[model samples]
Target: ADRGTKILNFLADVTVNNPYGSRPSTIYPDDKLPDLDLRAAPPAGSKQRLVKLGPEGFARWLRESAAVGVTDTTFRDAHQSLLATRVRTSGLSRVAPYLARTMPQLLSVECWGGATYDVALRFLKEDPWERLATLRAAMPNICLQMLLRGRNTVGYTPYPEIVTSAFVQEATATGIDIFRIFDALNNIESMRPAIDAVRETGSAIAEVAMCYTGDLTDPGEQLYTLDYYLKLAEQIVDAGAHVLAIKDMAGLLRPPAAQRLVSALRSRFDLPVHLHTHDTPGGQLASYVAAWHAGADAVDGAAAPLAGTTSQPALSSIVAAAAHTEYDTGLSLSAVCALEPYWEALRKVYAPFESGLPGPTGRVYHHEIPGGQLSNLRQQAIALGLGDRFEEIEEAYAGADRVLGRLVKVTPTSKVVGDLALALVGAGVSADEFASDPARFGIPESVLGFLRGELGDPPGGWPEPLRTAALAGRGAARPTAQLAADDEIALSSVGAKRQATLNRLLFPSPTKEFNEHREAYGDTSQLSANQFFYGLRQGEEHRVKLERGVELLIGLEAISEPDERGMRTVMCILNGQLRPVLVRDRSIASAVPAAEKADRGNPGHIAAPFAGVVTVGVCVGERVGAGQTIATIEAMKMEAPITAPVAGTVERVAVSDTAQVEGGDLLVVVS
Candidate 1:
């Protein structure tokens, strides 16, 4: 057992070779435990009764349990690691009735997929199918989970085995009782259509996972070894995976490679494994107590005030480090430490997207970046000011994960290797010019569509001269026919008027643009359903409810400036508490357009053809002709547009119409 005595007996079996201490008598301080009724049922021989069982009866009671279970991740990857998924389903329905009576005693409550289903439809307009029917009517006795992504179900592209079988039959009829899936490039044939749509949803469970990383004590790190995760856990137990997770998500699994990959998958699989990690580079509680002392029937954790930096590793400090240690997680640890002061007072109403850093940042094992996309890639590298080239975008994310071959990074291919490692550190291109002329330092139509095999065939392919400049002209079609040819041409051109032509291509006008701004502004019911789902400003002044008492007061308050043609004068601060209750001046909209400040030696401006949101499409005394279009932009979900090279007349449009801009900024000027 020498990998230096299995890293000194897996660090003395997770510290000092046994015997509990740090408050173990099954940990109890929420007013000294006790009240854990949770709708009482299992008492006799209880390993914390798997309420309503199913995840195939909690993977057959965790394959004949010896107590290991956990799962929590407090409402999905703990505020997706310090709030960039921006929590809020009105702050997770105020601890959904004590996490639905203490999340079925433990072992399942991830609470829906990562990036909380693409930030609940692009930045919280909510409705991720009514947040899985409001956490399945507030936890119908546990087992919720999510994290799919196989065939990119939780979206990042790839979807259309009829939209991954109608998104796993509408995410298992809107409740998702444990899917887990995976395939960020461990490609078991891209996780066979979401594990055959969660095995035709005959009561969900699936569970596949397997997205860890390298340096399994580096025998020249040949792409994440431990016999490449036991041959990807034998193709995730021949793709039927009733359970098998690993995941690690950039905590970089340590404790002697998590007790030799859970004792080589508990001696080559009988299923039910689950580890899923992330506490940044810090060893997630000794790699979850040496992958539950090498057997690992479950682990995940998070709840205690959204756990550590880059989340997970808290569930009352891993049930007080497995109490009396027969790997005990029979969970109650003082009734989940009484949900750490109600999620630490509902994390200060998401104090402006927190995570400025708190714990465990061991430099995420040299920036493998996926503590849920490292706090939204450090606020999109501080909104492209390239916040001091964040250590050269973490060395161009390990050189775009070795020029796009060493993938398995996770989620929409870890956001296509973090937007080609922030476009090779915003194109200043280094790391030896991205390993010698990465397509003469350009190549980003998503790293040439994952080097033209298009996000699927990533693993040992694509490393050569960036795969001959990402297949030079890219023809061999079938990149899942560009995600099922525009919903199969709006379902074969309106057969039964294709759901009203897919609701006018997904709500384009919003009923004459939201009743022409509530009849030209003036109390557009103080906006905020995330400010009319970010179609932004109808009238400033927004806080939109937090007021049901108990200190967090919060309401509305307005104030503005910059008038006289450059536009912008708000002032709508109603009601007094911290005083100020007036209400007059009407119009509160038009002032966005400022990106155009050019002459970075402008070869005739038009810039910002990259970083997203923008829109515009022409106005300022509009005329345009030569190649028309004008503005578009979008981002990670792709779209670039821009147009008009030789046309004229517009003269200036700059931004606004969703305005987010960046890659060079200017936007539109035409003469």
Candidate 2:
């Protein structure tokens, strides 16, 4: 408490990345093993209880129990919201044994879903399934929960029933016990596939969510009213949800609404209810209390280091608040705070990825950005050169939400709002103007996808002129009842290969990249956080646990001077064996001269609007017609189609296919 308290206070004071200027020298001392008094296998916790109780009996038990339960989100959503989902498996698994021994009362550990699934493959180069297995290995006494997006599974788009069913089956087969499912728009039709699939797993608990957004208490609000939520809950409960979770994604659920909604839901249904929320707008702890008083069966929170402001409300605070109350969590404050020191140090390791939300802001109420997207959008803004105008982006997000008929705004739907908002800011168009004349502006593909009803119909119905203009006479997209030709990937998996097949099908490119990364770097997840992210900081050494009873003490003695090919050598001491490896200095690539940027007002300069790899379809000296495709830039998986704005001769082509680019980099110039 003392060390973590000091580090956190200093972090709060500095209010920036790496107050220490470098990674912490060590997580803890290996020689001094005084603290944890752990059993070989901890006594049966909630997971064992669930395993014994079965899915049907567990729900019954939740309803009959007097004590409220907690789902600790430190391993997944907490870091996903706070650090852009960059906390690798090494860090999370390192702390799991301690958590399992210390806090066994947790109803479940929300560790394996949401952004973590994709981010693991895309950025961390770790197998998410493996991470789940590792966590279950250390903490087998607790239920492992995952968030699913129904038909969408974990990706941003809808998949066929086969994919959804296969995914849930694979997940439950791996380690997951509870599937906390939600659709971006709270569309029951969208959630039906996954919900049905979870039930099919038999051992798995299906927890359906009603995503909370907008004010349920607002008199003027026609949609998302109390009745709307009740009906949605009725649909979920009827669909055989063992647990009903109110997902306050943007922390928009105030205390009053929390009270009314939880009470009504509990009174109307014979099922247990769980409450989940972010603290983006503050006062969410008060909301938790209100829900608790109203009989919420479970609530979510995180360790102090990873809690609050876009992440879940503090678990310690919640546990403390319920110390003597009837809804007490039954977790000792000392036991809860014990892990804070480890997280405090680990957080510093991933400091570079912290979503720069200095603290809580009231603006979140107006924008209603979900916690997961808040960090993602910030990173996207920085990449798109809108970091300086984030305030504008926030406003544009709400504007986008309004234009799109105020979506439920989670995951896939939230990404749409963010994409549209980025487009609006880039085009310098207000929401009103876009709503009035969406046909005139070049909308992002996701916005068009939403208009095509790919996400699902908004509860309040679509905005007339806006939807009409965006659709431009084209009707809604074809029903996604089956996988299209491009969507289908042949999989003849008789066993564990199905998970890999699922990953490849749902996220082809990232999966490819992940496999390539593993081929090049092996399993980098085994390395310490500092080593994995920044590599050895000259003179630093770390022990890497290769496998059971096999370990290596790796040391970075010295790096030799760069060769003519920009390669360096002379790294040493792999388990007392001098192993010098040649490594190329990749940062030297950034030293190359940047390409000429496109002038904003110049229509001739058909350019990449943001940093990405540009694939030019047209060559230099070629002529192009109006609206002809000149080039397309792939930035962060979204393609920014660079069309001929006015059109004429392609006098210049600054980059060819696979050419790296930055914002405003001239992909071509039409004279």
Candidate 3:
């Protein structure tokens, strides 16, 4: 070991650092760039209004531009990567003014799409459409961009053509200016409906993305090479995309390949080429520099405080690197840094969700997990009591990828890989043993469905014996061939009908809950949207807004004792000034009752396997056999079937259809 270490160190001493080459010529700044103030209102006559010229106008601007531009992903991908999409609308609003001032200088700001859509509803409790409207009004000068999951729009499963078109139409009508559409399998046909819908809008830009992976250098059929990307570019143009993007979500696009790919893209297509990547593997900045040199039109970056660990390259650093280059961003450096202080303070607010990973990890190239998915995987591992086996999970991810034909690691597809990894690691068996008999050890049905082409067919076919096992008793001989393309129209209208459809498909609770909550909390219309999502209040008094630049003050003794008359007197010091006030009674706590716990005290009850919405398949007095599926509980977008452990007659049906339930909650009582 000592001899090998000595030899490695000797070679390292001679090896060249910064192998991707130095930064290009810098673009010097001038006094014309305005100073950004967090609290200041936007100035009049700002050229930012030019973006309102719409999609055609932007395309014309792209054609006439002398240098490349940048798209900031701070609102979306940045926090999604580092903070697990835990940034509230209130926190985002704090920096909105500053971002608005700088918006005219940037290509756009990515504030929607990917997991942000799902996470917002699942955890944030904020309506996605409302959030978009809020951001739209706050930053009217900037182009608002969202990631489109092809036919899925923002959800995981594939929707019919009509549904996909309706979603795009509604999304554009809501606020989305640039629709960055992508398919997990890089299947061009899957994006046709979205692209067509965006074209119909005529005012919105459709940016098609090619998800990237490392080139297979082995003596086999290479799938993700420069030629393959070039083909995708051609298809993107045919699909009516105004811009072409190379989405390196896992940060595997090294400098050399980036340069070559960008050069090839520019030579073949007249559309503007944008690069979006994470810094997971430590080579993002270098890759950006190379892509810039090779004629890429723009790249995505994040603010410093929220950048680097799993997000894109820092905007300030990227600007600095490109300062003297011919393809410089021309955006102000000081303005970029102006927002840093706000984000630095904001980081403390989301500290709990932070990945705790300090910098780039080269190991990402091996596991190929997307940055946004890493935080979720880690949390899941901890929740499942497999935190100590993270490395094993990583290894299982790679093994599953190999077993299921090298699937592209992106949303939905990446989730499948991650779920398989967790299942394999939790099973506590070697990859060989797991592969040999996953059913024996217990694996998710979704993993097998993926192998059977339920999501989509991979470039390479699934492994043999496993495929047969996965397809067995699933009631399909050829899964992909049996997949349906339904033209059945669910909704007839585009505006309200579309939203109603989304509410049903996505949330399923309807407006009654929100309306009921609002009615209970009187005068809560004044509360910020973030407050509504994260909860209106903690105890009694909640800080709604900050006062102008504060001054120090100390605590004072209570002016009076609490009163039983639902009123009280309070006194406090503000900025060394004594103040007194009369406090009125207020009740902000939710009045909703918790789900009733099951009667686990009885041995005849069939308990739910997880906390989820229960869909009962049997009624009371129904006869059931052992191992029969009594109910299906859905949690985290996956379904868990509650089966009868013993043969018996059903005496009581404990849960109604679509009722929320807790783990171990009674689904049925059998005797």
lDDT of each: 0.59, 0.72, 0.65
For model 3, state the Cα shift of residue 581 in Å.
19
TM, every model: 0.31, 0.89, 0.73
| lDDT score for residue 583 of model 1 | 27
Worst 10 residues of 3 by lDDT: 7-16
Q: Residue-wise lDDT of candidate 2 within 300-357, one digit each (tens)?
A: 9888988877888888898899889777678899877766667776676566787848
Give the C-alpha miss distance for residue 665 in model 2, angstroms: 3.6
Evaluated against the true structure, the overall lDDT of model 1 is 0.59
Clashes of each: 2, 0, 7
Q: In model 3, which residue pairs have backbone atoms overlapping below 3 Å? A: 25-324, 25-325, 26-323, 26-324, 26-325, 27-323, 27-324
User: How many Å off is the CA of 88 in candidate 1?
Assistant: 1.4
Winner on TM-score between 2 and 3 is 2
Sort by lDDT, best first: what order? 2, 3, 1
Candidate number with greatest TM-score: 2
